């Protein structure tokens, strides 16, 4: 591979060079041929597998901290060797697990928020052993991720993967979401993208409300075990009703959303750890709501109740009727975040504060890797900066990975 | 072996086996993606591509291995040897256009591709017959408003040193003025090339919308100025169906799109001009054309006129602005008996057309990046299609702007 490869943007005339792909680790999917860049997707760790994985780590933490080389450098290198050979693993320093946590967020090449990559809390939840101090640790998360609306990024980090038959796992896809329940007629009820776990939590005991927007219990998994379910104390949710500045009627939709986007499905790969427990949280970019959730087709769907209501012709798809009620829904959206004071940003200002953030990267550390199919945002896309922006996509480590839904690969006990 | 690309809301998974098919490469490697870079011959070359490419012209008439077929490979085989060349047969140009059309990637109107009128212009040898040829084209291809796709040949590279090229970009572009204010008037993307026109003794109109001249060159020889006669130019006068203040605006687009840059390459052989058109979808002007910062960039301007609040960004005027103006060009166009098509109705034609080739030709390459509407992405199909990008040839490829090359 060529030591530097040129990235252009279309509408600056700006070029930048990487070097920084030549740390790569992970395949893309992609080969010569084929390209499978929007590819959605495309029994542990040995001794001899783990040994180079964790030097490797080592080395990176130490030249980030400006002590490669040094005394403290190699002693510690001899002590994770030491583990890794009469343990066949090791554990990280405090210091090493926030370093890799913060730099798994910096890695994420799907990620438009970076620029915020290192103020993340973390929380050490390593000496976590039962469901209920689970539910203890992710509760805590919430409420200070939350932060009564001003929201904080955080991540909280459950005991690594030993033998894999005792893997620590959230069974939720995210801490808060809304349950979807399927109908005898075929109509779908609440959120359809949740229908499965729904109805896992309702097989698990769970009485459903049977509503639009019942939030979901946890499903939380400690050492191996059965998942547990609770309820998370409903002050500590914080949800948006959303209204328009404009028109009146919009309330009137009985929309809401929740203010906490808190991923727990991935799994934290740090030196060759893998910690299959880690949900994390920022805060939305309003298209992540307004667009997605509200107007997909197999999610909330809205958009045709919205224009009837804006009374649009719906008849010739060439009014662009879909495109106008879009816009409306993410004005909204945004809106009612922040006239309730709950912190989300415009997809204009994450784009933008994204390419100031890879020109930084780039200059500061050789390169910023990117998904240029997810960092485009799914309205407008071309009117932000992004659109015009070449991105070279290639996986460093530490990062967040995907992992098989836990109910496909759980032994019931 | 085998591929699936999923649709993640139909649920509805394809199975590529096209792809191996490949040889050309696309720029990725195991360890690095390049989807989204915009840009990433001898006789012992010549022979096993036209072999190739008479073998799988052959076996998509049904007569593999059959007499014409060994003969055709015979005649091509003695005529590399005594030449450095060859000519391809009418069909076999007709059958490596359309299939060029068919194998781009990045074209969402590939529904279409069977449909094409290929004007064969392989006996042209001065800029005078080029333009000849391209009037007609224009003609033809314009119709009066009923838009029908077209692609005129010219001759083949030999040496590099005697290439046909069309200097414009595509036959029909507006001029770009670089003001002493240091702004642009007309269209900023087509400055360079309109200042070259200029330096070759064209006489701008200096408005926002001057039809460009041609710019032809023949077997190597310096490009030749043309101006194309103003009643083949059709052009759209944009206004708003709600919006009467719209019209005060003054802006007007023409109606063919008529790429004129590209390299059309067949069996090895390089077709370094080979103009083709077909019809706009409305956001290759109304967002790409007028919008971009770079561009005609006029949202601040329509974003006055509906008095929204522009201090922050949060509250989606700029959003607001583009769909009125995207409205407005189809408005226009259609108001005008004048082809065109919404993104909506052409991601769904390209979805149907994605079935259809996995369907007959066990696949269909396609670049996310480039398919994907530039507004209102994930509420048009494609959004939510994976796709699989590859290189089969017969192609259209990039080439490099004659300015860059070209001795006088
Ligand atoms: C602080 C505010 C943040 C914003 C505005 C933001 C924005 C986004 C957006 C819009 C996406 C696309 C999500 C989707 O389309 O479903 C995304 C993806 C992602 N983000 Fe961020 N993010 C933030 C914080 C974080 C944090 C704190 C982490 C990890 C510590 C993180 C890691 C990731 C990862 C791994 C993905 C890829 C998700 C996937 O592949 O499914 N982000 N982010
Ligand atoms: C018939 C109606 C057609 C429609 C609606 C259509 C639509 C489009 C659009 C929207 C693009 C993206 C271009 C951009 O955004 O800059 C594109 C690209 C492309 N189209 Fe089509 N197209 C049509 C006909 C054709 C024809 C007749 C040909 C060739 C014979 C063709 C070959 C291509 C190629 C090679 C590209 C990629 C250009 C590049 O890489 O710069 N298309 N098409
Ligand atoms: C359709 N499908 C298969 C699918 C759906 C969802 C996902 C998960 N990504 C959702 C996510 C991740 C990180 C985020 C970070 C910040 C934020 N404000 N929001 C975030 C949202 C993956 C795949
Ligand atoms: C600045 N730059 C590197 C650049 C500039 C122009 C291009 C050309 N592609 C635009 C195109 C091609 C084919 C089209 C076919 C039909 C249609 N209705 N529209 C079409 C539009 C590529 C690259
Ligand atoms: C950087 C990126 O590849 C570039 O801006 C692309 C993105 N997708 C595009 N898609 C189309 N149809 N046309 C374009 O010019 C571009 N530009
Ligand atoms: C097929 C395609 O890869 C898929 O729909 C992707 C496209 N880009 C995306 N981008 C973001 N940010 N989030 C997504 O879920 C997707 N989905
Ligand atoms: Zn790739």
Redesign the pocket.
């Known amino acids: 591979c060529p030591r530097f490869l040129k990235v252009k943007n279309w509408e600056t005339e700006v070029v930048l060079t990487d070097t920084l792909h030549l740390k790569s680790t992970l395949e893309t999917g992609c080969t010569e041929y084929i390209c499978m860049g929007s590819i959605?997707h495309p029994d542990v760790a040995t001794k001899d597998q783990l040994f180079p994985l964790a030097k490797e780590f080592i080395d990176q933490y130490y030249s980030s901290i400006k002590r490669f080389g040094s005394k403290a450098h190699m002693e510690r290198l001899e002590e994770v060797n030491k583990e890794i050979d009469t343990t066949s693993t090791y554990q990280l320093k405090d210091t090493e697990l926030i370093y890799g946590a913060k730099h798994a967020w910096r890695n994420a090449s799907r990620?438009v928020?970076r620029i915020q990559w290192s103020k993340l809390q973390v929380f050490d939840a390593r000496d976590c052993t039962t469901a209920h101090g689970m539910f203890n640790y992710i509760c805590n998360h919430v409420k200070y991720a939350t932060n009564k609306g001003n929201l904080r990024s955080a991540i909280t980090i459950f005991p690594q993967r030993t033998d894999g038959k005792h893997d620590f796992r959230v069974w939720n896809?995210?801490l808060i979401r809304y349950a979807g329940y399927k109908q005898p007629d075929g109509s779908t009820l609440g959120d359809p993208?949740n229908v499965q776990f729904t109805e896992i939590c309702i097989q698990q005991g769970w009485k459903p409300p049977r509503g639009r927007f019942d939030v979901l219990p946890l499903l939380l998994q400690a050492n191996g075990n059965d998942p547990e379910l609770f309820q998370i104390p409903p002050e500590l949710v914080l949800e948006v009703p959303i209204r328009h500045p404009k028109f009146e009627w919009f309330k009137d939709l009985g929309l809401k959303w929740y203010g906490l986007?808190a991923?727990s499905n991935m799994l934290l790969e740090i030196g060759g750890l893998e910690f299959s427990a880690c949900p994390?949280?920022?805060?939305?970019?309003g298209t992540?709501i307004g667009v997605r959730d509200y107007c997909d087709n197999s999610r909330y769907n809205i958009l045709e109740e919205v224009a009837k209501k804006m009374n649009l012709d719906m008849r010739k798809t060439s009014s662009l009727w879909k495109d106008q009620a879009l816009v409306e829904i993410n004005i909204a959206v945004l809106y009612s975040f922040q006239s309730d004071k709950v912190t989300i940003v415009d997809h204009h200002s994450a784009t933008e504060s994204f390419i100031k953030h890879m020109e930084n990267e780039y200059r500061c550390r050789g390169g910023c890797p990117a998904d240029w199919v997810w960092i485009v945002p799914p309205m407008s896309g071309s009117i932000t900066p992004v659109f015009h922006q070449e991105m070279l996509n290639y996986r460093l480590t530490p990062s967040f990975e995907?992992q098989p839904d836990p109910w496909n690969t759980h032994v019931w006990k």
């Open positions: 959605m990620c928020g896809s995210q993208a986007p991923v994390f949280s920022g805060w939305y970019m992540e995907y």
